[PDB]
Design a protein around this ligand. Structure first.
Ligand SMILES: Cc1ncc(COP(=O)(O)O)c(/C=N/N[C@@H](CCCCN)C(=O)O)c1O
Ligand SMILES: Cc1ncc(COP(=O)(O)O)c(/C=N/N[C@@H](CCCCN)C(=O)O)c1O
Lengths: 710, 710
């Protein structure tokens, strides 16, 4: 934060000479000076360089409308106007609202003006930094000696070791110096919500539109467990989105809570849809309660919003219609919903208090904002017993939190404020929409096959596009209207191989091949389904990366159409079993995988296996407890029918839990088993494309076993 | 060739100032000046830096005995003595034989003296360069434009191409400019023996103690074919060393000559021994002639000297005892025998003319001297029809010889001249002997197994050590005395696994594992047997490389004793087959290979298969002609018995021809087949350690087939 832009070349010595002296004095104060040629140049510099901490210009040449243009980009950026002919009578109230400091031209005044500019820069830095992060940085500047944990003592231990010194050089001194503990009393305590931490929490709650907020240093998995434990005592009944992250299943294995499942939808691609509106109704829930043994009226409900693939619920209807006192929106994938009006009504914290209810949002700050991994947030709107919640919170948080992760959470909040933060979010959305339109254009002008994008036909303006029953782009049958919306940030590209009616074509390109090719060429996809690839167009994606992705996709298409050899196209895959992949070409491998998928009818089996719910014989807690008592046996996959499962079976694809612990496959649930059996067969043909079934175990002979209650 | 050493730091201006001015003038003439501190420093500088082209010293400080010391290292190196108090009366006749030029101290004389020194340096360069190489370099200096072959026109074509430019940058401009053809008339012609080429030949014949010499640009394989085709007309009988290179078999395949085989010996390691003296006798040859169909008294004889493993014959006894008018010594591995008295009587060109006989030596200049690959020599001592020999010569030589290869042959000859060349050869021999002694000392010091060296006990002084029937180090049974000698240059290291009596030990380390480890650590062995590794301590081996090899061997021993994992110890082997080599450790792999070798009794089968000669049914020419007519069939190995072989079977180990084309395996020759069958089994257990049988073909099912006369 040390770049100062000087805008003029004035042609009079009485201005130029003081400006040259000021240049020298500022450089003595450790500033880097840049010289834009004109106002458009300056505005571009500001747009492209966030380290620009100040602008100097001549008030005679440029009016204060230049300050208005600067402030529209960054309302806190200090601007220094040098006055010669203008006086106090030439400024208006609106002008005086801007962060402008006025100086005059004089020989010998460079030193005090530079001192004033240094003070203003420090004030700018202080204004944009959040309280905890500022306190941490100031403590580091103090350079105190520690005889307390952590044992590396501000990085000293690393410097005394060869390999430690390599680690220290990689991560840098500041990262080590800022790794501290609650022995440093001036920073307060996260667990006690004291000092700067308290301020941070309030800061976050204000930025994220929450009544209360909590920083979590072990991910949204831990955040979910905190919320669930506070909300669902033992013996209670909980409504669970069947498209729940396995953290919720872990919570159920930990606490003796009886689940009743919301049933979401799916399309032919295996992309998860939303829970239909009828599942939120009182009568449906009551009937399910009546049929479920040891079930009562639910005290807590958990809904995944958004889905992994970017489908958001209209949350106003859910908050109105779900007759449960506590509603928890697992919003891991959408921590940005408060920072753009296009998400209004599509997030848990949207709007005000719901009478008689408490709404939680759990957000993964590290997933789609800028924070270190494991940084997570809990947002609460509604009445809670603060002390009991604090107990549930401390039960899952370490007594030695990583201060860097905490500071990054606060800093993500700070990055979201003001004109600069609005530009960040809006720019990310606009970039995603431009990329989507470009994919559509390239697909249109492609002579043969090209990548498609999963979206409505005519996207024009930045918004969350509704899923409507008439349109068939989304592939969901008989979907409720004004219910599901697509987040433009989450871009799903489709490889050829599936027809528009839900069947698969004669030829196809499985998306795993494309993801491997992209990895070989320096591009990492978020995830890959059978014929879809997910790309996150977050605030960390710039034009360079998007254009590079387009170039990589066209390169893959050209290489595939030339039918290159796997040894050349995919060398790392070839290094897996070089004997198998000799003289094997790309089109043959792709067609073999596609024909294996088709012959086994993978889409129909995947769809049917997730449409029938396996029978719940005991809650996951009881089954897990019996597994802890060593009362389970490993049996083969063909014998699952009638056996109570001890473990969650989570297959990829589609990447969502298929069997929960305590559930039993009956005859009416046989397709589940068939699907799994199928995943075994297809997984045993091409190295590098192995089966991936959590909860199943590959034996030495190549068969698969599962653990069941003995 | 531009480094000038100035030796003094005097205390008088009338000397120092002219020397400083001379420094400046010489640097203007593109010389690099160095300043040794004392005479011992200067002598070390000369010893270590062959680019030192001149020495300047003060005659007052140092007498001309310094010039004697310099000349003992390089008798052509120019020395410039500055005279102040000494006069013409202070030089003796012996002193005036040294290459000393005398100057005086005077201000303003630096330019003239520097010009004289430049002329002397040019004279030195001209004196040590051989004629053809000098002519080639001068032509390149002329920079003529070519409209003739080669088509790259002195490298211009490469410069006009991107990838061509990469190639040109790698090999350099001079390499391209010197690639010329006989369209350049001033260089003469290799095929015509005209101009510089003629001079070169004479130069070579003088340096290598031959009456006539020929340069060959397609290796000693081509040299062997030239000699053989001149010496053995169709229908003649030739005596052939059974340990013959495949080139002699190729000659027999193209020429209708009937062979009778010298039988060499072998030891338990599979190292080839020498032909016993009785095989050279008239009675044995006559008896073999009377039993071979269509055999007459031999007109030509071919003997491999030395063997690959460094065993040299006493060639005087052979020249006296072999009653054949033409004797060809295939001396590919020993081109250096004329340049050290320790090889006296152990090479084909040793001594004078043998009355009534012609002696040939074929030498691979590129193998053990300094020449580009494919550079070879033919040396002739005795009467030949020069015109017929010239026909045999050109009918194996291309009309577009590579001038670089030819020049490198001549330059290797030039490198062998004078005090510098004698120092080269003697230094290489002493270096080899020091390494051998160090291996012995390290083996004595080792606690447990260590590498051994194949040599007699207590080698002391530089010589070719005789193989005697009393000693058992060589492992040859009932060897004639004063017959075979070991070349110290060829260093054979032994890994544990074989006992001193020829039996197989209970534990062993196959040498292929050591060679793979050495390759992984930047050291390339010449070749590897089952329990032996061959290292060539040529004139290209210095102290740095020998110490590096010792360190690598001790590192291997330490790593093996720690029993490291193959994944870490041998990464490339693991990458050959990652599934097989996961979690395998080095000791297990070595012991498995050793037990495979022992259980099949590889040494006994190897020895027995090469002790009985397969029956000749037709000469190799007839069998090869039948193969060219399509009258061969592919059969399996177990059906070998009774089938005339169409191709040479040459297995590794022991790396020498086992079956010749036209030979047939009978019941009495069954062990040969057994050995081969054994090799097949041995090669089918460890990836990276596959079977290697030339003339056998591995089928898809894994079996092996050979081609036989239908
Ligand atoms: C809906 C939902 N709720 C909570 C969490 C846990 O949040 P934390 O991971 O912060 O504890 C995740 C995590 N989802 N992440 C992926 C793998 C990681 C991403 C790889 N680029 C998964 O587990 O399926 C979630 O999807
Ligand atoms: C005795 C003998 N006479 C002639 C020749 C042919 O001489 P050219 O190779 O110049 O045509 C060779 C060649 N022997 N070379 C090795 C492999 C190359 C060396 C690897 N570092 C072999 O063939 O087994 C020979 O041993």
């Amino acid at each position: 934060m040390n770049i100062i832009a000087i805008l003029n070349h004035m042609g009079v010595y009485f201005k130029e000479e003081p400006i040259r002296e000021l240049h020298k004095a500022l450089e003595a104060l450790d500033f880097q000076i840049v010289y834009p040629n004109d106002r458009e140049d300056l505005l571009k510099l500001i747009d492209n360089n966030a380290r620009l901490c100040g602008v100097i210009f001549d008030w005679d040449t440029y009016n204060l409308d230049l300050c208005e243009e600067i402030s529209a980009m960054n309302e806190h950026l200090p601007v220094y106007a040098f006055a010669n002919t203008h006086s106090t009578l030439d400024v208006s109230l609106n002008d005086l609202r801007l962060n402008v400091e006025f100086f005059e031209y004089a020989l010998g005044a460079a030193q005090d003006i530079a001192q004033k500019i240094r003070q203003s820069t420090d004030a700018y830095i202080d204004e944009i930094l959040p309280p905890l992060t500022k306190a941490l940085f100031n403590y580091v500047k103090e350079g105190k000696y520690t005889f307390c944990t952590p044992g590396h003592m501000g990085g000293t231990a690393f410097q005394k070791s060869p390999v430690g010194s390599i680690f220290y050089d990689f991560f840098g001194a500041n990262a080590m110096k800022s790794d501290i503990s609650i022995s440093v009393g001036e920073l307060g305590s996260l667990l006690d919500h004291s000092g700067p931490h308290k301020e941070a929490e309030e800061y976050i709650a204000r930025t994220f539109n929450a009544e209360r907020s909590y920083m979590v240093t072990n991910g949204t998995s831990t955040a979910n467990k905190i919320v669930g434990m506070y909300s669902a005592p033992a013996g209670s009944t909980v409504l669970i989105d069947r498209n729940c992250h396995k953290s919720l299943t872990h919570l159920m294995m930990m606490s003796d809570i009886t689940p009743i499942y919301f049933r979401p939808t799916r399309n032919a691609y295996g992309i998860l849809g939303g829970i239909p509106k009828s599942e939120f109704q009182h009568d449906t829930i009551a009937e399910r309660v009546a049929q479920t043994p040891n079930a009562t009226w639910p005290v807590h409900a958990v809904v995944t919003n958004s889905t992994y693939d970017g489908l958001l619920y209209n949350t106003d209807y859910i908050k109105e219609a779900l007759d449960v006192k506590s509603i928890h929106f697992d919003s891991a994938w959408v921590p940005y919903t408060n920072f753009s009006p296009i998400y209004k009504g599509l997030c848990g914290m949207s709007g005000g208090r719901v009478e008689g209810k408490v709404i939680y949002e759990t957000q993964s700050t590290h997933k789609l904002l800028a924070a270190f991994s494991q940084a997570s947030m809990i947002h609460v709107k509604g009445d809670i017993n603060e002390e009991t919640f604090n107990e549930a919170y401390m039960m899952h948080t370490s007594t030695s939190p990583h201060y860097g992760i905490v500071a990054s959470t606060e800093t993500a909040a700070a990055m979201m404020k003001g004109n600069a933060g609005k530009r960040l979010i809006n720019g990310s959305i606009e970039r995603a929409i431009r990329f989507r339109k470009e994919i559509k254009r390239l697909n249109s002008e492609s002579e043969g096959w090209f990548f498609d994008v999963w979206q409505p036909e005519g996207i024009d303006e930045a918004k969350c596009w509704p899923l409507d029953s008439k349109d068939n782009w989304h592939g969901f049958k008989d979907i409720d209207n004004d219910h599901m919306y697509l987040d433009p940030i989450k871009v799903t590209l489709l490889t050829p191989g599936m027809q528009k009616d839900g069947s698969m074509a004669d030829t196809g390109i499985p998306a795993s091949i494309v993801s491997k090719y992209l990895d070989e060429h320096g591009i990492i996809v978020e995830k890959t389904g059978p014929y879809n690839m997910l790309f996150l167009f977050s605030i960390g994606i710039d034009k360079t990366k998007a254009l590079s992705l387009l170039r990589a996709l066209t390169d893959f298409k050209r290489s595939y159409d030339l039918n290159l050899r796997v040894k050349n196209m995919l060398p790392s895959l070839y290094r897996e079993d070089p004997e198998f992949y000799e003289n094997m070409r790309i089109q043959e491998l792709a067609q073999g995988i596609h024909a294996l998928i088709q012959h086994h009818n993978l889409p129909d089996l995947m769809y049917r296996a997730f449409e029938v719910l396996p029978t719940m014989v005991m809650n996951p807690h009881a089954a897990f407890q019996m597994e802890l008592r060593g009362q389970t046996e490993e049996v083969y996959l063909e014998e699952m029918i009638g056996k109570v499962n001890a473990n969650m079976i989570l297959p990829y694809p589609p990447g969502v839990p298929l069997v929960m612990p305590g559930e039993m496959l009956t005859e009416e649930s046989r397709p589940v088993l068939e699907f799994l059996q199928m995943l075994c067969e297809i997984g045993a043909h091409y190295p590098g494309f192995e089966t991936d079934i959590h909860g199943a175990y590959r034996q030495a002979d190549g068969r698969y076993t599962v653990k069941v209650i003995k």
